[PDB]
Every structure is written in C-alpha cells, then in structure tokens.
Amino acid sequence: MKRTFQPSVLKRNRSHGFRARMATKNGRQVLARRRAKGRARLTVSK
Amino acid sequence: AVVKCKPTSPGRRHVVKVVNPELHKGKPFAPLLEKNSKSGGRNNNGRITTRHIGGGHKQAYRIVDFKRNKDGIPAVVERLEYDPNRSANIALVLYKDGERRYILAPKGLKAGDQIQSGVDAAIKPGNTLPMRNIPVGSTVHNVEMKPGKGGQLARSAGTYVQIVARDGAYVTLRLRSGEMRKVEADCRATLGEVGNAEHMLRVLGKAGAARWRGVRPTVRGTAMNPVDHPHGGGEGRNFGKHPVTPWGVQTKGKKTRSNKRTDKFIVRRRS
RNA sequence: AGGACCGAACCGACUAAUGUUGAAAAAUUAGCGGAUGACUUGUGGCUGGGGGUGAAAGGCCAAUCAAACCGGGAGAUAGCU
RNA sequence: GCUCGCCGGAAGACCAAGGGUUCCUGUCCAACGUUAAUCGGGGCAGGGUGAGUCGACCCCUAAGGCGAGGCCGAAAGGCGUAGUCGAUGGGAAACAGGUUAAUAUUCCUGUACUUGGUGUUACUGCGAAGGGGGGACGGAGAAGGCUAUGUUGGCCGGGCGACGGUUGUCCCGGUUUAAGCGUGUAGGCUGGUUUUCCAGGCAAAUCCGGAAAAUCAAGGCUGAGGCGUGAUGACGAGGCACUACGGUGCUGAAGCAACAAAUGCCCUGCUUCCAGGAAAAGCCUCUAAGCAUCAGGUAACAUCAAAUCGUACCCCAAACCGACACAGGUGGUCAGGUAGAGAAUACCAAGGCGCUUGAGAGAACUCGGGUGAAGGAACUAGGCAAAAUGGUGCCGUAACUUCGGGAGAAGGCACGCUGAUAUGUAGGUGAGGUCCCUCGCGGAUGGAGCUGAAAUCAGUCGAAGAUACCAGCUGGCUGCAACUGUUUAUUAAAAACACAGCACUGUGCAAACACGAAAGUGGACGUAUACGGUGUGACGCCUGCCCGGUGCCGGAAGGUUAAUU
RNA sequence: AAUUCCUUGUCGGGUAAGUUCCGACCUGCACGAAUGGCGUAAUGAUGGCCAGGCUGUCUCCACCCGAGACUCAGUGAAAUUGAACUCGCUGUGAGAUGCAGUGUACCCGCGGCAAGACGGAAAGACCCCGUGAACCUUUACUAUAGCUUGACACUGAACAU
Structure with a gap:
C-alpha cells in the first residue's frame, strides 16, 4: 500500500529547511523556540 | 460548413x-x-x-x-x-x-x-474607420469604446453592431445583446460582421469535447449538502427554496448591475 | 475515424473464499471492469482549517475530518460516574 | 561437487528516487537472524569509490517562488515592476578491449573528439543588455527503407558415443570487433542566382520581410543504414611451458553468406484530423553607439588549461516507503529460443533462486484442489459457489433499430500426421551474368540460391487433432439510467454524480461573479454565436391550468418612514 | 408503478403448485408533465423474472492429492485473570460450580465439541437523563459581513426657471 511518507530531500529542504524557516517571521520563531529548548538539530537540513 | x-x-x-x-x-x-x-x-x-x-x-x-x-x-x-x-x-x-x-x-x-484603415478608407467589409465617417445604419464589428484603445464590442464568431444614429460627438449603437449604447464619434469600427456564423450550430456531442475546451464539470448544487450550497440536500430531491447562487444571490431575475459610473451611454439596456 | 471492439502491461476494485491477536492498522487467491482516453504516470509547483479541494460521498486535506495537526488560554466546565 | 526443482517481459541485468558503507577481505558467534549456525545486510578491524568527454555544478528558461524601488495595508505584512531564483525541459565533446578480492566510457592499451586561454603567421570590417533567423515542439494513422537481434547454411576446431544404430543429409562449440574519420545512399524538404527600390522589424542595417525585373534549371539543406578506414590490431573456441590446480607468460584456427526481423533508427519526417499543439539561451546573421597604419574578427599551426562535487553497494528490494530480514507499495532502461496474433501462456537460454525452523505420522475438523453412480437447481433470500462455454476459417444469423447497430446473435461444418499436386507451389527475397550509363551505394534484364504460406486430393493413428497452458455460456420478458465516464482511500460503484443537449436568468467590459480590510488577481490578454449562475439531463412525441401566497422584475398618485434641521 | 395502505387487488399468461415476474383492468390510500411526463435502439461487474446447457448447490455424501491440525526436537506469544479444594438436579434468592436439600463422583493428563461460566473484546450507537456538546435548517431570538437609501464631508463655478 502507498504510505504517507514518500521521501524527497529537495521537497524536504524546501518545505522544512533552514532557509525556508528563515524566510518568514514565524519560521524564525520556530528556530528561536528550538534554540531555547536546546535542540541539537534545529532543522532537517542535513 | x-x-x-x-x-x-x-x-x-x-x-x-x-x-x-x-x-x-x-x-x-x-x-x-x-x-x-x-x-x-x-x-x-x-x-x-x-x-x-x-x-x-x-x-x-x-x-x-x-x-x-x-x-x-x-x-x-x-x-x-x-x-x-x-x-x-x-x-x-x-x-x-x-x-x-x-x-x-x-x-x-x-x-x-484588400483592406485598409483610416478616414480615407473605402466602405467595404474589413476596412476600419472612425464611426464618424461610417454611414448611419451600417453593420460593423470590433468596435472601440474609447478612441485608441482597441476594439471591444462584436468580436465573437458571428457578432455585429448596427449604427442606428449619430447625434454629435457620439453615435448610437445596437449591440447584439439588444442594448442601445452610444460611444464617441471617434472610436474605430470595422465594416461587416465577424465571419464564423456556423460556430453556433456546432454540437460537441460528448462530455470529453467540453473538457478539450477547458470546461470542467458543473455540479448543480441541489446534489450537494447544505454546508456546501444553499440548495443543499434533503432526503431525496426536495429543493424547497428560491433558486440562489452560491454565496446567496437569486440568479432568476435579480439584476446585479451596480456600476452607476457610466449611467449615460445606456438608453435601451435590453429587452 | 472512434470518450469504438477483444485483450496483456498499466490504472481500477463487481463477486466469492481465506485472513480477522492477519503475511497485511483493508491484503491474498480465483474470476471481474477500463485499457487512444473525461486515460494513466514520474518530477516539481499552487490552493491552509469555518478555510481549501470536491464529475458531490459530507468525500479528501500525512493510517486522524459534520470543521486537521501542534502548542497555548488550561488545572476550560462537568448539579454526572 | 553431482543430481532435483523454481523464475526467466523475471524471482534476470543496468539506473534514478531514497538509503548511506549495507560493498570486498580477515576475524568473532554473546546479542541481532522467529530454529541450529562454523554462516549473515550481525560484532570488531582493515581495505575499497581515480573522469576535459557519464552526472551534478555551470549557461538558458517553464510552472511557480522571492522581489530593489513602487502600490496597498492598524502592526505583522500583502501584491507586484525592473530583476533574480527555480527542471521534471534546451545547451560542447569517448569508444572498444583489458584489468581489482572490492572502482572504471573514471585506471591501463589502442584509437579519438569538444570548448576555451595564450602565442605565431597570413588575410581582414570588428562591435549590443538591440533587430531577424534558428532553436521550436500536438494527436492519430500509414506504409516504405534499415539496424539491433535471431535462424539456417558454409567455414574452423573437436567428437564417433555407458544400450540397438550413429564417418554421415550426423553431434557439440565458435564464427565477435566500437566510437571516430571518409563516402553522403534509401528517402524527406525547398525553385535557385544577380541587380534595383521600399510607409515595416521602437534608431540603423548588406540581415529578415515586401515590391518590380533579368537570367538558368540544376542549386542547396537535412538524412538512417550500408561500404571503406579504424583493425598486419584487439577479442577468440582451444593449445604449448610454468601450473601452491588459486592462475599466469607465449601462441591461438575460422571469424563469411543468405534469410527473417522489430514497439528501436531514418521520423523533430510523410499523410490526415481538430481539441490547433512551452519558453529562453547556446548557435547563425544584422547593424547602432563606438574603434581602425590599433583593438577585434577569420583560417592554419604550436602550446596551455578543462577546476570542483558525485562515482562503493541495494534499488519491484532483507539495504527505499510500510514499527519486522513484513505475501503490500515503488518511476525509467535492456527484451534471447520453441510454439503463439502477441510484452498473453507453456517449456527453456543467459543469469539468478529453492523464499532462515525441521523430522515423522497419514485421526476428526479446517484450508486449497481432483474425480464421481443415478438424478440435474429438487439447494438457496438468490444458480452464491462450482461446473460449463472458450480458438481459427467457411456457411449462416431473428425481433427491434437512432439504419451505425443488434451480431462473435443464435446455430452448423471442417481443424492432427504423412505423401502428392509442387524432388518446397503461389508469393517474398535476390546473386552471378548480360546490356545501358550523366562510369555510381546507378538503372534495366536476369533468374541462381535462400525463405515460405494457404488450399485440394489421397492415405493414416487415436476414445478424443482449436487434444496441454491459453481461451465468450447463450437466449427470452422487464424496471431504472441514454451512452464512455465519476463516487463514500478503509462495509454502499448504484437507479446517485458528470455528461452532450435544452431552458431560465444575469452580465456592454474597469462586465457580472469570485479570492482579497486594500492594492490587485482570476474571469480574459476573452467581449453577448462571450462569460457566470440555476435547473433539467442523449434522442423522439411533448411539456397543460393557476401570479392568491413567497421571491424576482417593473410602476407611482397617495399614505407611513431614518439620520439631519 | 423504485409511487397502491387496504393487498398475495381482479382477470389472464407462465409452473403439478407463482406474496415474485410479464400483460391488461383502474377502486391513482398518496403518478403527472424541465425538482420534467411518456416512450426509446444501443450500453450496464445495475434491479427483478423465465428457459436451454451445465454441474457435488442439493437428494447424500464417498474417495483421493496437498497445506495445517496430531507426535518428536528447537525457539517461543496473546487476549484474560478478586481469590478457588471450579459436579448434576430441584428449590431458594427475581435464570446458582459456590445457599438449602438431595444425587452422583478414585487422583492427573491428551485429543476433540462448543451448551454454560448472563464467556472475552469496546465505561450500550437503541432508550431516557444533563438547565451537556457539536454541525445543519428556518418566515426561532439577538446581532453582523455584504448589498442598498439618504444627510454631511472630499465638493466648485456661473446662467435660467
């Protein structure tokens, strides 16, 4: 059966990547929350 | 043919x-x-x-x-x-x-x-002249509404307007809709009718032919549920309300022209 | 020539049996429908929640939909267990 | 290692996506592996991915995204111009062989090719963020000409048979060779050449386009494949010396022809149809501003450079998505033999597997199958299921019908093998030879050889000849919907939704309408034979009466009536 | 009749027998003409009915081939579970393994069946309740976007009646 996750690193980075997060006010707030929480992986970049 | x-x-x-x-x-x-x-x-x-x-x-x-x-x-x-x-x-x-x-x-x-445009052009089909020089009572197409911007009226397959009067710097026109509109007597118009008159006699014959034209299917609204359309649903085919657009407008006679900006070029709106 | 015919791939899912702590959170087997088209498919893109999209079933919108998910208001309120 | 069995339009091979060392070697068996395990995609260690030509990067753009200014918006921010990003598309060039335990069009051998920089020589009008050309494009169909590939024969080498026969019309195997360069063919498109003039291509233009003359018909472009060269080579079944029987040096014969033939190439073609079929750059040209005993441009030769990243391995799967070593899902490419219409199906090749618990027993019952006396739907909600029909050709085929259909209606006959017709026919292919010739990949003639149906007659075996796999049950009455289609992913595929068609109504363009506090966008680069909404739902015969109510469209004398005053 | 309550309407057809089906009758409970009416060739994995053929669908099952079940070795779950020394009957308490009376019954396994343990599974979807929700409807109430009316403002000039 066709499942939900069909991986594509291009669509992954364009949708949740670092530059995609830094391109909007709210995306930058996501990084701020993850930095404050102490996340080791801020994004899905690599 | x-x-x-x-x-x-x-x-x-x-x-x-x-x-x-x-x-x-x-x-x-x-x-x-x-x-x-x-x-x-x-x-x-x-x-x-x-x-x-x-x-x-x-x-x-x-x-x-x-x-x-x-x-x-x-x-x-x-x-x-x-x-x-x-x-x-x-x-x-x-x-x-x-x-x-x-x-x-x-x-x-x-x-x-041969065709030609301008004021010194001959009165023959295809020639484009200002309606000031077009004889009254003639048939034209691709008529300008404002001088110099381009034809906007009677551009379809077999459409045409008739110059019925010319009072001053304006001329009166009988549009294919029956509307009696008047435009300046400097707007260019092309003599004759647009020739594809048989275009109306065409019968697509099947659904796919409409999809070729880029027309997607039309879902009525009585076939929907009330959350999707006023006509909504009901157990069976009920439809016990006045016909209405989506977004709630009559659609069965209610005039919706609310321009009021021209209000001057219209004389015999239609019908 | 054909939203033409028979029929593989491909796309579908009408019947039956099995399975039902399954091999599988919808499949398998035998048959079944369409199969040059309103077809199908890869890649990328757009539409964001009272909104989208919908050949319209209240269908689908990440195994979740008569109003998604996450967090917050929040220890909502609960004359009920 | 010898057998057996399975896949073989894959259960084989090569990739993308994705994963990210799962690849190779050695070593280990606690855990992981649904059992054991010496084994492993497990643990530990080491090793392994070599590019001017493959791909990415790069140049160019599509959808779309961002967006200097700008417009708009309480703020956030939204839209969008110039621009700049963005492939799933366009854009220069490498082939064969050999080689590693693991990489290769990347290393080696051989043979090549492309784009740039620099320099020299010679001849020179060079120049764009501009103009034009080109790039540049649909569906279906039709053949024709070719190749991949295959078959047979010939050739070379080997073999003479575990059991009757097998020195022959016998058996096994091999018979391979690229890009590039040269030739420019089948065939496709187009009439060329020169001069003169011009409201066009934002200015210019020798270019494009247009106009009027003269002169010739042979000019050019495109173009598979073939042939030649590449190649006195490489590869090569098998040998000769080493041979730890793990492999290495040398040598290594034949290496042709015919036929068949693609869904691949000529073909971005040809024909035809309507639903009328990307963009930009590279590239080829045109000149402007400007620069000329310069600079630049063209050709030849020489020389330099072509970086950087990816390259292992899996990739219909045990390595990706599915929590699993999960009967699931996953795009592209390669496409052998016999039979066959066929990529169906059966059996096989290359190659790869026997699916990570086995042994025994041969109860009930369950699952998946086979056969069945007599009867034959008596079963049951219901012929559910099963059984049955099943192919080709010929004959033949009703009601009804929108004259297309219904229809493969129904139903009936014949199908094998052998021989002859005909030592293999009709047909297809086509050599030598001959003749012609603008002497070429030419034409005509010629018919060798190769290939090869179908039919008839006769004979013959079996219970059965479309013998297996494969492969319509049919007919009659009737409701609903015209039809093909669409739908509740995951209990409903339908009489429901669409549908062509019909009607009403709105909309004169800054359209109605819709998304948007707005700007603006869609509608539409459309203009009433258009667009939106509503209902109905092919077609045919039709669609009657009622405007009191509700709504809508109009109208006015009067009454009533808001803010305001 | 996809519509007919009465109703298996009545008659006829088909069957030995037909609440279905087909054809007529009309007494249309409660058809009806674009929320279309009546027909309609073709089409349909569509609904209903009747035939031929076919058969293990059945009368009525039998045998056979395989995969499980069974035994051995290895590995090794699950739901459930107040505790159990966990029988029948009749009665009792509102359908008893557990109380009363009585009967029967050596202790423990394996293979099977599924009547009960009101068996397991999911705080019943029916029903009612809550001054609980959520969506939906409308000539329910109150509001409101939008559309629309006018006044003032952006908004001025003269002329005539």
Whole structure:
C-alpha cells in the first residue's frame, strides 16, 4: 500500500529547511523556540 | 460548413462539426505568437475564483490587432487561420510595407481581398474607420469604446453592431445583446460582421469535447449538502427554496448591475 | 475515424473464499471492469482549517475530518460516574 | 561437487528516487537472524569509490517562488515592476578491449573528439543588455527503407558415443570487433542566382520581410543504414611451458553468406484530423553607439588549461516507503529460443533462486484442489459457489433499430500426421551474368540460391487433432439510467454524480461573479454565436391550468418612514 | 408503478403448485408533465423474472492429492485473570460450580465439541437523563459581513426657471 511518507530531500529542504524557516517571521520563531529548548538539530537540513 | 457525423459510436451520434476548408492547414505565423499558460480559474492567491475551468488542449496566443491604427497602407489577406483563443477565425494580412498582422476575419473576407484603415478608407467589409465617417445604419464589428484603445464590442464568431444614429460627438449603437449604447464619434469600427456564423450550430456531442475546451464539470448544487450550497440536500430531491447562487444571490431575475459610473451611454439596456 | 471492439502491461476494485491477536492498522487467491482516453504516470509547483479541494460521498486535506495537526488560554466546565 | 526443482517481459541485468558503507577481505558467534549456525545486510578491524568527454555544478528558461524601488495595508505584512531564483525541459565533446578480492566510457592499451586561454603567421570590417533567423515542439494513422537481434547454411576446431544404430543429409562449440574519420545512399524538404527600390522589424542595417525585373534549371539543406578506414590490431573456441590446480607468460584456427526481423533508427519526417499543439539561451546573421597604419574578427599551426562535487553497494528490494530480514507499495532502461496474433501462456537460454525452523505420522475438523453412480437447481433470500462455454476459417444469423447497430446473435461444418499436386507451389527475397550509363551505394534484364504460406486430393493413428497452458455460456420478458465516464482511500460503484443537449436568468467590459480590510488577481490578454449562475439531463412525441401566497422584475398618485434641521 | 395502505387487488399468461415476474383492468390510500411526463435502439461487474446447457448447490455424501491440525526436537506469544479444594438436579434468592436439600463422583493428563461460566473484546450507537456538546435548517431570538437609501464631508463655478 502507498504510505504517507514518500521521501524527497529537495521537497524536504524546501518545505522544512533552514532557509525556508528563515524566510518568514514565524519560521524564525520556530528556530528561536528550538534554540531555547536546546535542540541539537534545529532543522532537517542535513 | 456544417456536417453531422455518423453514429458509428456513442459520442459521435449528435456531434456536429463546423469544417471550413478555407482555413490554413499549416502552422501559424510565429512572430505573432506568445505563450498562454492555463490558470484553472485560480488567481494570484491560488484560490478558485471562476469554477468549471481546468485542463483542455494547449493553446498559443495569436497577437490580434484590435486597434487597426495602420492608416493609409493597403493590406492583402494572405490566408484565413484557426484561432483557439476565440470563436471567430483570424486573417493574416500583409501590408504593402512588409508588415504582417492578425485581424478578426469578417463574414466574406477571402485570401487576396484588400483592406485598409483610416478616414480615407473605402466602405467595404474589413476596412476600419472612425464611426464618424461610417454611414448611419451600417453593420460593423470590433468596435472601440474609447478612441485608441482597441476594439471591444462584436468580436465573437458571428457578432455585429448596427449604427442606428449619430447625434454629435457620439453615435448610437445596437449591440447584439439588444442594448442601445452610444460611444464617441471617434472610436474605430470595422465594416461587416465577424465571419464564423456556423460556430453556433456546432454540437460537441460528448462530455470529453467540453473538457478539450477547458470546461470542467458543473455540479448543480441541489446534489450537494447544505454546508456546501444553499440548495443543499434533503432526503431525496426536495429543493424547497428560491433558486440562489452560491454565496446567496437569486440568479432568476435579480439584476446585479451596480456600476452607476457610466449611467449615460445606456438608453435601451435590453429587452 | 472512434470518450469504438477483444485483450496483456498499466490504472481500477463487481463477486466469492481465506485472513480477522492477519503475511497485511483493508491484503491474498480465483474470476471481474477500463485499457487512444473525461486515460494513466514520474518530477516539481499552487490552493491552509469555518478555510481549501470536491464529475458531490459530507468525500479528501500525512493510517486522524459534520470543521486537521501542534502548542497555548488550561488545572476550560462537568448539579454526572 | 553431482543430481532435483523454481523464475526467466523475471524471482534476470543496468539506473534514478531514497538509503548511506549495507560493498570486498580477515576475524568473532554473546546479542541481532522467529530454529541450529562454523554462516549473515550481525560484532570488531582493515581495505575499497581515480573522469576535459557519464552526472551534478555551470549557461538558458517553464510552472511557480522571492522581489530593489513602487502600490496597498492598524502592526505583522500583502501584491507586484525592473530583476533574480527555480527542471521534471534546451545547451560542447569517448569508444572498444583489458584489468581489482572490492572502482572504471573514471585506471591501463589502442584509437579519438569538444570548448576555451595564450602565442605565431597570413588575410581582414570588428562591435549590443538591440533587430531577424534558428532553436521550436500536438494527436492519430500509414506504409516504405534499415539496424539491433535471431535462424539456417558454409567455414574452423573437436567428437564417433555407458544400450540397438550413429564417418554421415550426423553431434557439440565458435564464427565477435566500437566510437571516430571518409563516402553522403534509401528517402524527406525547398525553385535557385544577380541587380534595383521600399510607409515595416521602437534608431540603423548588406540581415529578415515586401515590391518590380533579368537570367538558368540544376542549386542547396537535412538524412538512417550500408561500404571503406579504424583493425598486419584487439577479442577468440582451444593449445604449448610454468601450473601452491588459486592462475599466469607465449601462441591461438575460422571469424563469411543468405534469410527473417522489430514497439528501436531514418521520423523533430510523410499523410490526415481538430481539441490547433512551452519558453529562453547556446548557435547563425544584422547593424547602432563606438574603434581602425590599433583593438577585434577569420583560417592554419604550436602550446596551455578543462577546476570542483558525485562515482562503493541495494534499488519491484532483507539495504527505499510500510514499527519486522513484513505475501503490500515503488518511476525509467535492456527484451534471447520453441510454439503463439502477441510484452498473453507453456517449456527453456543467459543469469539468478529453492523464499532462515525441521523430522515423522497419514485421526476428526479446517484450508486449497481432483474425480464421481443415478438424478440435474429438487439447494438457496438468490444458480452464491462450482461446473460449463472458450480458438481459427467457411456457411449462416431473428425481433427491434437512432439504419451505425443488434451480431462473435443464435446455430452448423471442417481443424492432427504423412505423401502428392509442387524432388518446397503461389508469393517474398535476390546473386552471378548480360546490356545501358550523366562510369555510381546507378538503372534495366536476369533468374541462381535462400525463405515460405494457404488450399485440394489421397492415405493414416487415436476414445478424443482449436487434444496441454491459453481461451465468450447463450437466449427470452422487464424496471431504472441514454451512452464512455465519476463516487463514500478503509462495509454502499448504484437507479446517485458528470455528461452532450435544452431552458431560465444575469452580465456592454474597469462586465457580472469570485479570492482579497486594500492594492490587485482570476474571469480574459476573452467581449453577448462571450462569460457566470440555476435547473433539467442523449434522442423522439411533448411539456397543460393557476401570479392568491413567497421571491424576482417593473410602476407611482397617495399614505407611513431614518439620520439631519 | 423504485409511487397502491387496504393487498398475495381482479382477470389472464407462465409452473403439478407463482406474496415474485410479464400483460391488461383502474377502486391513482398518496403518478403527472424541465425538482420534467411518456416512450426509446444501443450500453450496464445495475434491479427483478423465465428457459436451454451445465454441474457435488442439493437428494447424500464417498474417495483421493496437498497445506495445517496430531507426535518428536528447537525457539517461543496473546487476549484474560478478586481469590478457588471450579459436579448434576430441584428449590431458594427475581435464570446458582459456590445457599438449602438431595444425587452422583478414585487422583492427573491428551485429543476433540462448543451448551454454560448472563464467556472475552469496546465505561450500550437503541432508550431516557444533563438547565451537556457539536454541525445543519428556518418566515426561532439577538446581532453582523455584504448589498442598498439618504444627510454631511472630499465638493466648485456661473446662467435660467
């Protein structure tokens, strides 16, 4: 059966990547929350 | 010509074709082509603003000259061509100076017929002059509403307006809708009628033919649920309310013209 | 020529049996429908929650939809267990 | 290692996506592996991915995204111009062989090719963020000409048979060779050449386009494949010396022809149809501003450079998505033999597997199958299921019908093998030879050889000849919907939704309408034979009466009536 | 009749027998003409009915081939579970393994069946309740976007009646 996750690193980075997060006010707030929480992986970049 | 196909299959019984052998059986003039990407009825916000639009055959836009501002230069018709962007056929005309342009094809315009624009042009089909010099009571098409911007009225397959009066700097027109509108007596109009009159007698014959034109299916509204449409649902076919648009407007007589800006060029709105 | 015919791939899912702590959170087996088209498919893109999209079933919108998910208001309120 | 069995339009091979060392070697068996395990995609260690030509990067753009200014918006921010990003598309060039335990069009051998920089020489009008050309494009169909590939024969080498026969019309195997360069063919498109003039191509233009003359018909472009060269080579079944029987040096014969033939190439073609079929750059040209005993441009030769990243391995799967070593899902490419219409199906090749618990027993019952006396739907909600029909050709085929259909209606006959017709026919292919010739990949003639149906007659075996796999049950009455289609992913595929068609109504363009506090966008680069909404739902015969109510469209005398005053 | 309550309407057809089916009758409970009416060739994995053929669908099952079940070795779950030394009957308490009376019954396994343990599974979807929700409807109430009316403002000039 066709499942939900069909991986594509291009669509992954364009949708949740670092530059995609830094391109909007709210995306930058996501990084701020993850930095404050102490996340080791801020994004899905690599 | 109008021809009824034979019922060799369900979907060809009622199809009626409009074949015209005079049309060019070749490629169009490339310098006058442009990309025309489809929209699906969606606007810059990506929302469906006009329903029932989607798919269809790829189309290239032909740059048609609706202004006809090359005055004093005769032009000969090279060939009649099929235009997918409109119901009427277009004509590739060659000016004496070597310039080529597309124009709407009038009723009886053929290859080799000469045309001309300007005030000193002759009163014959295809010629474009200001309505000041057009005799009253004549039939014209591709009429300008404001001098110099381009024809906007009577551009469809077999449409035409009739100049019924000329009072001053204005002239009165009988539009194909029956509306009696008046425009300035400096707007250019082309003599004759747009020639594809048989375009109305065409019968698609099947659903797929409408999808070729980019027309998506129309869901009625009584077949929906109330959350989707006022006509909504009901156990069976009830429909116990006044006919109404989506978004709640009558659709059965309610006039919705609320311009009030012109309010002057209209005389006999219609009917 | 054909939203033409028979029929593989491909796309579908009408019947039956099995399975039902399954091999599988919807499949398998035998048959079944369409199969040049309103077809199908890869890649990328757009539409964002009272909104989208919908050949319209209240269907679908990440195994979740008569108003998604996450967080917050929040220890909502609960004359009920 | 010898057998057996399975896949073989894959259960084989090569990739993308994705994963990210799972690849190779050695070593280990606690855990992981649904059992054991010496084994492993497990643990530990080491090793392994070599590019001017493959791909990415790069140049160019599509959808779309961002967006200097700008417009708009309480703020956030939204839209969008110039621009700049963005492939799933366009854009220069490498082939064969050999080689590693693991990489290769990347290393080696051989043979090549492309784009740039610099320099020299010679001849020179060079120059764009501009103009034009080109790039540049649909569906279906039709053949024709070719190749991949295959078959047979010939040739070379080997073999003479575990059991009757097998020195012959016998058996096994091999018979391979690229890009590039040269030739420019089948065939496709186009009439060329020169001069003069011009409201056009934002200015210019020798270019494009247009006009009027003269002169010739042979000019050119495109173009598979073939042939030649590449190649006195490489490869090569098998040998000769080493041979730890793990492999290495040398040598290594034949290496042709015919036929058949693609869904691949000529073909971005040809024909035809309507639903009328991307963009930009590279590239080819045109000149402007400007620069000329310069600079630049063209050709030849020489020389330099072509970086950087990816390259292992899996990739219909045990390595990706599914929590699993999960009967699921996953795009592209390669496409052998016999039979066959066929990529169906059966059996096989290359190659790869026997699916990570086995042994025994041969109860009930369950699952998946086979056969069945007599009867034959008596079963049951219901012929559910099963059984049955099944192919080709010929004959033949009703009601009804929108004259297309219904229809493969129904139903009936014949199908194998052998021989002859005919030592292999009709047909297809086509050599030598001959003749012609603008002497070429030419034409005509010629018919060798190769290939090869179908039919008839006769004979013959079996219970059965479309013998297997494969492969319509049919007919009659009737409701609903015209039809093909669409739908509740995951209990409903339908009489429901669409549908062509019909009608009403709105909309004169800054259209109605819709998304948007707005700008603006869609509608539409459309203009009433258009667009939106509503209902109905092919077609045919039709669609009657009622405007009191509600709504809508109009109208006015009067009454009533808001803010305001 | 996809519509007919009475109703298996009545008659006829088909069957030995037909609440279905087909054809008529009309007494249309409660058809009806674009929320279309009546027909309609073709089409349909569509609904209903009747035939031929076919058969293990059945009368009525029998045998056989395989995969499980069974035994051995290895590995090794699950739901459930107040505790159990966990029988029948009649009665009792509102359908008893557990109380009363009585009967029967050596202790423990394996293979099977599924009547009960009101068996397991999911705080019943029916029903009612809550001054609980959520969506939906409308000539329910109150509001409101939008559309629309006018006044003032952006907004001025003269002329005539």
